[PDB]
Amino acid sequence: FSRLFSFGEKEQEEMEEKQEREEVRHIPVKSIIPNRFQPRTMFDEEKIDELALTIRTHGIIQPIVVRECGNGRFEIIAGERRWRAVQKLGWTEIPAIIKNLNDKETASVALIENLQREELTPIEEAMAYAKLIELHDLTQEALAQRLGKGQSTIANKLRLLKLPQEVQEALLQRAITERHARALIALKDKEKQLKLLQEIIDKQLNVKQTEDRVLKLLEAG
């Protein structure tokens, strides 16, 4: 499990400061494919360009991590930004380290990398945490520790899955903030959550106003 959290540039740099650099291969750029288990990533082109400028001066401080796939192709485990950066530089080859990961591990890394890079919307974060917990028979604490997060960051997200559909839909549609949905969790009752949801959208209530209305509803006998 733990090694699936360790393939990104920062963590590879940290391990390499304690030991011999892994063997590097120079793989074809044309033969690289992004992780087939994560959706198409829409990067900030601005940040890919910053990264390309850094590499064109200072080299590629870490090789990407790939597994072998298909006929002589390489699937990214870590390094999609670097791969994108060296295309801007016109490279035909990129330094890489090859790891044998099975599909379940490659799928796990897809979720983990998406969590670490702070990509995901709240419900996406929730679904990713839920799946890593189910796949690996994990504690919320055990997962939070491995992600370098507080147990509450996980729980706040996992609880959004226990909310009713209408509230989840409102959060996904950005009709309410997460902190709105969070406060509605305290009501622990679908009917009250739905009535107060309609109020939030109709009167365009903020977080303070919603939290107050949740306390006043829970203060009732």
Author numbering: 5 to 225
The authors write:
Here, we report that a nucleoid occlusion protein Noc is a CTPase enzyme whose membrane-binding activity is directly regulated by a CTP switch. In Bacillus subtilis, Noc nucleates on 16 bp NBS sites before associating with neighboring non-specific DNA to form large membrane-associated nucleoprotein complexes to physically occlude assembly of the cell division machinery. Unusually, Noc is also a peripheral membrane protein that directly associates with the cell membrane via a predicted N-terminal amphipathic helix (Adams et al., 2015). We provide evidence that (1) CTP is required for Noc to form the NBS-dependent nucleoprotein complex, and (2) CTP binding switches Noc from a membrane-inactive auto-repressed state to a membrane-active state.
However, we could grow and collect diffraction data for a C-terminal domain truncated apo-Noc (NocΔCTD) from a thermophilic bacterium, Geobacillus thermoleovorans, to 2.5 Å resolution. The structure was solved by iodide SAD phasing, as no other Noc protein family structure was available as a template for molecular replacement. The asymmetric unit contains two similar copies of monomeric apo-Noc (root-mean-square deviation [RMSD] = 0.9 Å), hence we used the more complete subunit for all further analysis. Each NocΔCTD subunit contains an NTD (helices α1–α6) and an NBS-specific DNA-binding domain (DBD) (helices α7–α12) (Jalal et al., 2020b; Wu et al., 2009). The primary dimerization domain at the C-terminal side of Noc was truncated in the NocΔCTD and hence was not present in this structure. Most notably, electron density for five of the 10 AA comprising the membrane-targeting helix α1 were visible in a 310 helical conformation. From the structure, it is apparent that the visible membrane-targeting sequence (AA 5–10) of Noc is indeed amphipathic, with distinct polar and hydrophobic faces. We noted that the hydrophobic face of the amphipathic α1 helix is buried toward α5 and α7 at the core of Noc and thus is unexposed and unlikely to be available for membrane interaction. Sidechains of F9 and F11 also interact hydrophobically with the side chains of I116 and I81, respectively. These interactions thus bury α1 in a potential autoinhibitory conformation.
